[PDB]
Symmetry: C3
Subunit: 533 residues, 3 copies
């Protein structure tokens, strides 16, 4: 077997050059396809060219930053020193300019829009003040992250809701997701037949969850998700001054569920502080996961609003966490350790697809059973309350009626008008007591009723509300914060870090309340930027 | 933050009074609602008043018993001493009076009813005698629990089946359950659509199981179930002289499944005797769980009979266990340890609801798969037996035909007439070899056929049987005793107590046989008290 | 209790004779039934008589072999010594006779059949040569198992495909399975109603899997499966000279899945060599399980071909494993240890049925979810490729089109004609990238189209292929070898033997490739023996 030994020696001697040459050939082939497509027709091949250009730009950028980091830092150092020298007097100028800009924006846009937008701004202030007053350590508050998070939310809102470029970008992004969720029908039609639409939720909506989980697992294998997470976390870390671990988890929670996002920093969990743990749980509670987005879109909820709320929730979560539970210890973990995310044990892409599919079994099972139980309990509670109410000649008593009054002030402060605040309060109650699936289903009912065009009042009962109120409700309801998920959150986090069971239990309720407040802050900003139609 | 420190000091100083005052205010509000409801209209508000009155009575009673236990015991002591002094001669008088009462009841009621009721009494005697003859320790039998359990069963039967108050109470109780199981349709209609009735069992019956498990978990969180269990267990403990642990488990098994009832005494399992372990498994085998009651009611089985059998099974289970495997050791566990039931790890009611829902996934999955497998095996076995029978010009050979002859004597001794005994034997076979779901389905078929009113015989084949036989079959079939559940019982009990694996395996088969005998004793009593229509 | 003591003493004294007498009485009863059935009518009772005769023959045979093993070995020893003495010159004569027979068979049958059969033979040679060239240890090859496995495959093919007795036997065997899979409808119709056919796959096909798993568990309890396994493994061990452990696992994999077949030798796994581990994984990858056979038959795939391929796969798997990874160590485990198969923990048959049913839950769940995900991914990939292809005026680009060219040479070497090779390549791609369920579904589509009789070409697109190509595809696709099952195989095998994790990972990919090659060798033989219609 002399030839085999020669082949093995040749392979060993120049292993690095052989695989690099192969990869170069593949890249050259892809570029040849792109250039030929552009040559044959450019307008038809434009999106492929755009994708290739942006990918090349990002690759070159990352290589340069990795290679020339020291030189760039040294080059930037002098300006930082000069700014540090003049900051003692320049801080007042910068702060005054920012305050003046806020006042001008209010006077010349928010007042023009109407009273409800000003009420949204007031509600923003009031929620922040209530967070401060009931803070764990009111005297230890570091105010930089709070203002920076609120400012980042405002800037994202201006970019996406008040500019044609961002509005178009996110409408397009939402439309792509709607196209993407239709591919699951191919599998649903085989497994459950051409009559799979006879059972819409079970045989059409849950397969969307399965498919989305599969795709997310594939993307995690390929390493794209970690790349986006690192970028967003770096932005939040450099502006708000938050710790690397909580920034990474907050950025990750945009795409990943509360129970799986801490796995990004699993090794370092035992050494995190109390504040970072609170921030982790709050970020978990203030966001949703990319596996359940398609279901909410299938109900009829706006995709663009869901994506915008998911993006805006992270800085809100971090600001509210730092205000509610500020840092009184010294963090141990550093940036390099936090940013490295131990990938899963998948040898190839198809194994990642199978692992993503298998994990989705319990998710859909629990979703279905929880919905069954919650809706049966709702029916029983309404029947019991009607039974009790009839003893006072008020058989209309219901869970919805009580929630329409209990939660109305929260909706009013978010900028919802007087009439529609009572309807939004019912959705808040549904989310608080059962979950966000039920609330989004009811919101989809209201949206469909509005879209039909029927009467707005029948026998004195309002049937549907305005579109602005629907957007505000979409922002308010985007989260996994409910009283029933406290146990699963605590259990999973203890499983990852058994030593910290005592600390985890202490901060969980405060974290849930903070997540709710963060969703309401996102809703307040959306309300103050949207106009009355 | 001086105000916050003042608030914290105020909260700490008078924590006990603050929460007590809050609870008092809530109670006052509830009482105000009740009294106002009665004032506006009394006949309409009667049930609420009754519920409030009984709750108040039980609260006051428990407080008094807890506070004045020593004084009451001291007050009762003299009479116990006097009775002990005169018992050597008074025991004969009491026993003779009881025997005379039994003879009179037989002569003046059972003989009047007919021959079948006397046969039911004879079958009671015969089953007890067979239990004694094949006993583990025939010379170590303590006869007090045996007679006390049979007497308690007879008294419950007289109260519920032979008095208007008890008959009405349990008919009302059964009717409430039927109303309760209808609430699951709200969730089933959403998850599975308005066509969920196209698949009746899977999309309408199993959701009932899910909902009932959820409600049972909520009740276990609230502590009501343990309260009822403690009351019933105390009655059985004080009359039959049984050990606290087995009394608690027997009372618990009325509501809870065999695999979960031992968790009530999980810490103390390693130290129980062989007899107590046998009693635990027997109680597990002689009863059903509150999660699967609604399914049997949905089939068409009488709710009142199911509840009555579930209540009557516990003293029967304990009597048969003590007769089959009497106690030859010294029990270690005491009343206080047995009565304390470590509650689950649920922080609030909604978490208990979610935990109850999640646990139901495996239950319904196993139910469905087991039914599929058992019914396919039944079809294959019947086809094979027809194939074999045709070789003797008897292609009618079947599992049902063989069981109609094998188990007929057991049904005859329970008081079923000659014609219907062969039909009841088939149900006994179904329960023995596959499970009680299959048997109750077949019984529901027979009940529906009777209710239609069609011919009782077609081509010489009896189509349905009498109502008394249906009741007797309902009592006989109420249990989880089948050859296939021995493994899961043993596995779970070893998991709770690994050290006792050797003892658990030894007594499991005897426990299964005892459970079957207990169900047959309940059926014998029901037969001797019911009349022929 | 003197009588009970006397009974216990009587039972203890003559325990062996009592149970032997009882078993003898049962046997006498069975024989009486058989003889009476024959007396009443013989032609009607023939199959029962045949079954009884073969069972008696095998029982007597096994008893004699167990009792007289030493005498038979001593009696055979002289002839073995004489053959060993004359072998140095007799080996050339035997080898020349075999080569001459092969040449004659080719010339007088394969050439008569046509060119495609000769191409099948050439493909057999080419696959073997490629296996040798890329072997782990090309200089350490032991050639006896390779030739013996290929010869055993050829002999089985001649017996089953080219003789009336074997063809009839396996057609009958296939027809019995079709009858057997119909019994699951009884359970499916109850659990899912009379409309269970509205959802064919989920409510009719998976119940077949459940039922088959139940039956396999029952047979494993009874010990029949181990008996057949031992016979086949002994044949392969004595002819091919393979190690006992790998022979037992290869024979077991005919009936049992890859993830459960190693449990037959679980205790001895830590001490197996690298080659035996590779052979175990290869045997796992080259076969299917008896639980999923009914689903493929339900699609419309030939039962006889599936059974024949499953039988032929084992010697192919062992030959390809020994050629790809030959043995360079000393095996430790012996025949007695390998042949003993620790049975499961089931106390009775019905417990085995319940355990078989419960295990099937995860199997069907994973099957369904994996199919959903794979088919949605296929739709997305096809849409993306059409989007890319339209940039070159080729919107017909698809996964099927690419696979029709990538895998065509493999199909051509198996003897598929030029036109149908492109269609078989698509099935090979489906199996390689997703799994064998998808591939068999597509093959069933093609078979149904052929059976209808419509046009073979519409608008220049071939709709269906010949029957010989369908058989070749049936043989090629019979295996669990796909890139996504590597992880589950590795995980389970590490779980059974944690110490060997390093060795398991090394050989898994080579094992998967070997399994694919083994399926292709079975297909090559089938192609060279089948005729063109
Ligand atoms: C338009 C809708 C949304 C717009 C959002 C725009 C968001 C921008 C909002 C406001 C722009 C101005 C931001 C400057 C805040 C400086 C205060 C600070 O951080 O120093 C701290 C005092 O911090 C305080 O306690 C003073 C709080 C009052 C300051 C109100 C401004 C002390 O130093 P530090 O603790 O180390 O920090
Ligand atoms: C098994 C576990 C529980 C079964 C026990 C029955 C519980 C449900 C009966 C109550 C019912 O449905 O009627 C409701 C009253 O509901 C209540 O008053 C209960 C208050 C809490 C009103 O329904 P209605 O009587 O049709 O009027
Ligand atoms: C109407 C339908 C159902 C009615 C049920 C009514 C049930 C009431 C039935 C019968 C009422 C009389 C009960 C009194 C039983 C005394 C026997 C006893 O326990 O002492 C034991 C003898 O025990 C024996 O071995 C004697 C057994 C024969 C006694 C038959 C009576 C010895 O003492 P012990 O071992 O320490 O106990
Ligand atoms: C895969 C695992 C097993 C598949 C193997 C085939 C087993 C079923 C064939 C037998 C069958 O269904 O016909 C039955 C005979 O059933 C028997 O005689 C079997 C006795 C045990 C009678 O059905 P028939 O032939 O239609 O009349
Ligand atoms: C008709 C379709 C299918 C028919 C299949 C029929 C299959 C029968 C095929 C061929 C029948 C002849 C088989 C005899 C093979 C002897 C070679 C052997 O094993 O000794 C080895 C040389 O092994 C070699 O390297 C020589 C390889 C060339 C031999 C080709 C023949 C050395 O000794 P070993 O290593 O200890 O072994
Ligand atoms: C949530 C996770 C992902 C959602 C993100 C959207 C991804 C799907 C959009 C692409 C799509 O469906 O159009 C396809 C293009 O597909 C591609 O070009 C993607 C290439 C890889 C073609 O479909 P078309 O646009 O209807 O034409
Ligand atoms: Na999240
Ligand atoms: Na949010
Ligand atoms: Na029970
Ligand atoms: Na019972
Ligand atoms: Na296999
Ligand atoms: Na194969």
């Amino acid at each position: 077997e002399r030839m085999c030994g020669r082949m093995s020696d040749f392979c060993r001697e120049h292993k690095t050059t052989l695989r690099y040459i192969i990869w170069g050939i593949l890249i050259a082939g892809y570029l040849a396809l792109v250039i030929a497509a552009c040559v044959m027709n450019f307008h038809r091949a434009l999106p492929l060219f755009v994708i290739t250009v942006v990918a090349i730009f990002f690759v070159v950028w990352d290589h340069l930053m990795a290679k020339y980091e020291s030189q760039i830092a040294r080059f930037l150092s002098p300006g930082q020193r000069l700014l540090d020298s003049h900051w003692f007097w320049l801080k007042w100028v910068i702060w005054g300019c920012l305050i003046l800009g806020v006042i001008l924006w209010l006077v010349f846009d928010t007042a023009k829009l109407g009273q409800q937008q000003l009420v949204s701004f007031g509600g923003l202030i009031i929620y922040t003040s209530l967070t401060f007053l009931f803070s764990k350590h009111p005297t230890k508050v570091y105010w930089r992250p709070v203002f920076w998070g609120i400012g980042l939310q405002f800037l994202l809102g201006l970019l996406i809701l008040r500019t044609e470029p961002g509005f178009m970008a996110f409408d397009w992004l939402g439309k792509q997701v709607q196209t993407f969720l239709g591919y699951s029908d191919a599998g649903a039609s085989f497994v459950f037949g051409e009559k799979y639409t006879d059972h819409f939720f079970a045989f059409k909506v849950l397969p969307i969850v399965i498919f989305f989980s599969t795709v997310m697992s594939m993307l995690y294998y390929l390493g794209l998700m970690q790349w986006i997470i690192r970028k967003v976390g770096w932005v939040m870390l450099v502006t708000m001054g938050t710790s690397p671990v909580e920034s990474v988890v907050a950025s990750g929670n945009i795409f990943i569920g509360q129970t799986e996002s801490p796995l990004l920093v699993r090794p370092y969990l035992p050494y995190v502080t109390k504040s970072e743990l609170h921030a982790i749980m709050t970020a978990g509670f203030s966001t949703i996961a990319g596996s359940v987005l398609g279901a909410y879109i299938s109900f009829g909820v706006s995709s663009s609003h869901l994506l915008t709320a998911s993006v805006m929730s992270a800085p809100a979560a971090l600001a509210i966490s730092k205000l509610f539970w500020p840092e009184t210890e010294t963090p141990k973990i550093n940036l390099k350790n936090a940013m490295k995310m131990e990938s899963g044990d998948s040898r190839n892409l198809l194994e990642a697809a199978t692992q993503g599919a298998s994990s989705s079994i319990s998710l859909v099972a629990n979703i279905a059973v929880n919905l069954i139980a919650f809706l049966a309990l709702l029916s029983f509670m309404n029947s019991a309350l009607s039974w009790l109410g009839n003893m006072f000649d008020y058989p209309q008593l219901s869970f919805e009626v009580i929630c329409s009054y209990v939660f109305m002030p929260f909706a009013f402060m978010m900028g919802v008008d007087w009439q529609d605040s009572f309807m939004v309060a019912k959705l808040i109650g549904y989310k608080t007591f059962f979950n966000e699936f039920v609330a989004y289903q009811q919101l989809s009912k209201l949206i469909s009723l509005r879209q039909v065009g029927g009467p707005k009042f029948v026998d004195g009962v309002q049937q549907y509300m305005s579109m602005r109120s629907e957007a505000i409700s979409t922002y308010a309801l985007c989260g996994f914060a409910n009283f029933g998920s406290l146990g699963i959150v605590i259990g999973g986090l203890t499983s990852m870090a058994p030593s910290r069971k005592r600390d985890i239990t202490a901060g969980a309720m405060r974290a849930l309340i903070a997540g709710t407040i963060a969703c309401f802050l996102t809703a307040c900003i959306a309300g103050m930027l949207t106009n009355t139609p």
